[model samples]
Target: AKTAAALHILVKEEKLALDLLEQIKNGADFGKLAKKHSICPSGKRGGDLGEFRQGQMVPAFDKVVFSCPVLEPTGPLHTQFGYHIIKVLYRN
Candidate 1:
């Protein structure tokens, strides 16, 4: 299986997701912001999604995770679950 690791902040609104993205770009800590604002339970672990296979997540989410540049946060991408700010950590 192709596996990747990522971190993400999931929120119910695109506005909140955009706000958090700004915070991230302005030198705020991604993990801290995730803990404060993310609705995903992974927020408690600083948004770490650990490692998973290619198709484990929803299609939109999986596509980005596999295709985006690593360690650079990218999003406000919409998915069935919500809006997301995703940082791909690595893949193998």
Candidate 2:
């Protein structure tokens, strides 16, 4: 089991989340885009979630943060909050 730090851009629509993911993959700055587009207050801080343990977030969120390859942005995982574009910064 691992705890992780992550940044995420949350969007209302899955399509928007997916598009952001593509932009991120194409060398777009994830933090900047997150500030511009994310609805969550964390967007103001470049979507940084700081550090968190597994199960601390929604189950959908935990799956991505814990299992995805670090530094590889991933998502559009839907939860009650909405779709997410998540970048797992580290885990331990």
Candidate 3:
């Protein structure tokens, strides 16, 4: 089965998402940021979504995690849940 492991910080607003992305790009730790700011329950685990099959997530989220470069923080992606800052860790 095709699966991926990813991390994310979900927030209600795009501004916060973008701010977090900037912080990440400027050397802030992704996990620490997730713990401090993400609204998703997954944030409790530093935004680790564990390993999930392709298509298990919302289409917007699935598309990025399965297709984007690995290990790079990559979004203020919008979904029905909210804006998200995502980092795809691995896929197989």
lDDT tens digits, residue span 1-92, model 3: 26877777778877787777788779779878888886556567538768777676656767787667877678777777788667787676
Better of 2 and 3 by TM-score: 3
lDDT of 2 by residue, 1-92 (tens): 55777776668877777677787779778778888887555676538767777776556767776667787777666667777677777676
What TM-score does structure 3 among the candidates reach?
0.79
Instruction: Compare candidates 2 and 3 on lDDT and give the better one.
Output: 3
**Tens-digit per-residue lDDT, 1-92, candidate 1:** 26777666778877777777777778778777777786455666537768877676656767776567766677867777787677777665
Q: Candidate 1: lDDT of 19?
A: 73
At residue 79, what lDDT does model 3 achieve?
72
Show pairs that collide, candidate 2: none
Off by over 4 Å in 3: none
Q: Estimate each model's TM-score.
A: 0.78, 0.74, 0.79
lDDT order of candidates, top first: 3, 2, 1
Which has the better lDDT: candidate 1, or candidate 3? 3
> Which portions of model 1 show Cα errors greater than 4 Å?
none
Quantify all predictions' global Cα lDDT against the true fold: 0.71, 0.72, 0.73
